[PDB]
Every structure is written in C-alpha cells, then in structure tokens.
Amino acid sequence: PLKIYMLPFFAQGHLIPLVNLARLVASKNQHVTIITTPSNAQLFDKTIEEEKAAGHHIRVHIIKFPSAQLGLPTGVENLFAASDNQTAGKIHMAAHFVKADIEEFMKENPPDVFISDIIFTWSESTAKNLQIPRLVFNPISIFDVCMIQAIQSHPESFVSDSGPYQIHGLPHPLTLPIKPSPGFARLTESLIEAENDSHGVIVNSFAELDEGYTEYYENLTGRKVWHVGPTSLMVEKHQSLTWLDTKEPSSVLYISFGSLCRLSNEQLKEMANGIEASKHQFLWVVHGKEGEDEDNWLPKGFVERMKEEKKGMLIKGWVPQALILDHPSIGGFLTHCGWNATVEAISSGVPMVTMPGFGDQYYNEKLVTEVHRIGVEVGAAEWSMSPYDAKKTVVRAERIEKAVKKLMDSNGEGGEIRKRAKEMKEKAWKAVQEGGSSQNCLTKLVDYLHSVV
Ligand SMILES: O=c1ccn([C@@H]2O[C@H](COP(=O)(O)OP(=O)(O)O)[C@@H](O)[C@H]2O)c(=O)[nH]1
Ligand SMILES: [Cl-]
Ligand SMILES: [Cl-]
Ligand SMILES: [Cl-]
Q: Which sites bind UDP (predicted)?
C-alpha cells in the first residue's frame, strides 16, 4: 500500500473532485491523506468518517489557513466565502502561503506520492527537494487548456475588433463571438509547459469526452493524461418536483445559475422576456431575491401570467437539483456551464442551453455545443474573468428565446441534441462503471505508481 498525499485547492470545483479521487484511491487499498484547512475539511469530514468506518485508510491532515497573513477574517477559507475580486485573489494567494506548513509536514512524514492541484505551483520544487514523485490534478476536462493554447498560438485570428473569431489547429473547428479578455490564460502555465520526466496529469474527465484533445495535449506537452473521472460519478417532497409531476416528459426547461454566477437585474429581465417569448414551460430557480420587489428584476406582472397560463414556476431558494435533473419532465438545462453543472447534466442526459458567466465556463460551453452537440449556445456578450464584476453588456432576450426554441422545439435541431445528450449519459456512466475507461485507467495509474515507488 502506498502513502499518497493529496493537496486540493480551496475552491469547491477543485476540492470535491480531488476528495472524490481520494476516496477512489483509498478504495484500492492505498493510504491516502488529504491536506486541507479546517473550514474546508468540515465540508467532507462526515464522508471521511463513513469511509474510515468501511475500513478504507483515508484521513485528513489539517493545516492552518493563512488568514492572518492575508488579513482575512476567520472562516473565509475558500472561494465560496469570497464576495469580491480582492478576497478571491487573497484565497488564490493562500495557496502559496500554505507551502511552509505543508513542506514541514512532508519533510517530517514523507509520503510515497504527492498529488497536488494545478494551482500549487511550488509543489514541483517541493517534490524534487524531497525526491518524491508528483502528479498534477486537473479538476476539469483537458479540452479547456487545449482551447486556451490554440487561442494563444493564433493571435492573428483575434486581431479584429468584432467577432466572430475562428480557433484553428484543434480536432474540431471552434468559433467565438467575443475575444478572450486579458488574463484568460491564467492557471495554465503548469499544464502547458513541456514534460520534465513527468509522471503525467490526472484529469477529472473521461476519455470519450476528451477524445482528440487528450492526444492534442499529449503531443503538445509530452505529458501522459490519466482520465479517472468524473470522480463525482466514480464514487457512486419539494414543491418543484410536485409541479414537474404534472408535466409531459422532456417538456420543461430547467433554469439555474446558482449563487456565485447570479445574474444582474437587467439580465434577469431580459431572461424572463426571452423565456416567456419562447412559449416553453420552465422551472426557474433564482438565489438571493427573497424579500425583494420583483419589479426590480422581472417584467411587470411576470409571475401573474406565469401561473395563469400554467407555463412556468419560479422558486426563490434551494431546490434538489440532482432530483430535478433526473426527473423525466426536464428536457433542458439553461445554466452557466460550470464544470459541476456540466457533469450533472451529462450524468442525467439533459441537454444544456449554455450561457457562460466567467472563467473556464466559456471553454466548457464549446465542449458542450460545438464538440459534442449536447447543448445549444445562447451567445455570449462579454468575456468576464471574474464572477463578481458586474457585466457592462447583457444577453438580449431574443438570443435566449431563440436558443430555447432551438432546443425545446420538436421539429428541428433539438431532437439530435437531445439524443446526443442521452447517449453521452450512457458513455459517462459506462466509463465509470466496472470495466469502463476511467476505472481501467484508475487501476493502471495506481499500478504505475507502485512501480515508480
Ligand atoms: O438550489 C440549489 C443550488 C445548487 N445546488 C447544488 O449545488 C451545486 C452547485 O452550486 P452553485 O451553482 O452555487 O455553484 P457554482 O457552480 O455557482 O460555483 C450542485 O451540486 C447543485 O446540485 C442544489 O442542489 N440546489
Ligand atoms: Cl466530478
Ligand atoms: Cl449578468
Ligand atoms: Cl479502455
């Protein structure tokens, strides 16, 4: 059994995929330690207790979050607790400050293998000075870094002031309506750089989804890709459901952007008009609007006609999203294309209507709509690097209405996309089931680590 230390970054889209990888590797009779901070460990300690109770050798080593060095108040230890770019940048800076406590812990208790999130750039020098193999963990598909690199390597394609823009050199032709904003290629230098006797990159995706981009990346960097994901699938009555029980199969568009990527008042109004003009049934979940005048973010009397024509339901608060996406009445998912939303949509076979909000979501959109055609693209109006900055432009209602109609209408393109989405669901569960690509690759990874030690 190997001694494997796993270092997640302090963000939910990074933390939970790496924790799930930790549960998978522990389930293969390995000694796994997750190194994290107190507020983050309490997001999954109950799962760890259940794994320990099943005989799996998995534990959490607590390190102090550098709140004092950053001037952050206690309990602000992940991006979900940040509310502005300054705080978000400080949490990114925290990845550098934890280096001393982690290096000290590893010089005293050296493990056999060190697995660290892409962000901890110091992990390379730490593994060399301790003479220990290190693998990088990428919590999303390898397609994103490929799209980024293709953009970076073709600056002549983005010289025009107005789009569309062509992305060349990839397995698929890709287009962008808006050019990437300065700094779009952050947190990729560790992934794009060539190999220096690399043990590979662990990728939270599956081979079928990344097909072609796996080879593009390996050819570009020389580094092996280990597809072991989606790890959230590998480790496997609310009034909304009651309303859905009255609707025809695949007849309801589910709309949810969550809390981080919540839309502006002007954007919510454009959305309601486009959704209403689409004439399709909808389940719209909005966060952070309880006790606010609906006229501030909805058209006049939107909710009145919404219930009179029996078209839509608007929920202000938390909904069981996993059960909603599994309900047969849902026929579409309008969302921001975050990785977790993308994986959940795939796992439920639900086609997406893509409206990316910030960051990696513009690349996730293209994987969904232009590579795999398991969703429909609304059309971005602004490229934002941050979820907290207010957008100077808005996605107009006709674009939202046209995209919903394109997916939800029967006689057209939506039938193919709906069928492709159902087939990707089967491919995703097959990859994580017994004998699937990601289960086989996880076994080969652990075997390879044994021969490296
Ligand atoms: O009303 C809600 C909002 C979110 N979620 C779950 O919370 C995660 C997504 O949270 P959120 O959208 O806030 O995260 P973001 O993608 O914006 O970072 C997923 O597992 C969803 O299933 C949920 O169950 N109900
Ligand atoms: Cl996942
Ligand atoms: Cl917005
Ligand atoms: Cl295989």
A: 259, 287, 318-319, 321, 340, 344
Known catalytic residue: 117? yes
Question: SS3 string of the chain?
Answer: CCEEEEECCCCHHHHHHHHHHHHHHHCCCCEEEEEECHHHHCCCHHHHHHHHHCCCCEEEEECCCCHHHHCCCCCCCCHHHCCCHHHHHHHHHHHHHCHHHHHHHHHHCCCCEEEEECCCCCHHHHHHHCCCCEEEEECCCCHHHHHHHHHHCCHHHHCCCCCCEEECCCCCCEEECCCCCCCCCCCCHHHHCCCCCCCCEEECCCHHHHCCHHHHHHHHHCCCEEECCCHHHHCCCCHHHHHHCCCCCCCEEEEECCCCCCCCHHHHHHHHHHHHHHCCEEEEEECCCCCCCHHHCCCCCHHHHHHHCCCEEEEECCCCHHHHHHCCCEEEEEECCCHHHHHHHHHHCCCEEECCCCCCHHHHHHHHHHHCCCEEECCCCCCCCCCCCCCCCCCCHHHHHHHHHHHHCCCCCHHHHHHHHHHHHHHHHHHHCCCCHHHHHHHHHHHHHHHHC
Q: Which CATH number fits domain 239-428: 3.20.20.70, 3.40.50.720, 1.10.340.30, 3.40.50.2000?
A: 3.40.50.2000
- Fold held by 3-235+435-452: Rossmann fold (3.40.50)
- Pocket probe for ligand 1: among 336, 340, 350, the residue whose CB has the most ligand atoms within 8 Å is 340
Q: Is the CB of 261 under 6 A from ligand 1?
A: yes
Please identify, by atom number, the ligand 1 atom nearest to the C-alpha of residue 319: 1
Q: Best substitution site from 80, 321, 354, 365 to test ligand 1's pocket, by max atoms within 8 Å of Cβ? A: 321
Protein residues with C-beta less than 5 angstroms from the ion ligand 2: 17, 230-232, 343
The bound ligand whose nearest atom lies closest to the alpha carbon of 338 is 1
**Where in the chain are the domains?**
3-235+435-452, 239-428
Same CATH fold assignment for domains 3-235+435-452 and 239-428 = yes
Q: Resolution, rounded to a tenth of an Å? A: 2.2
Q: Does the CB atom of residue 347 touch ligand 1 within 6 A?
A: no
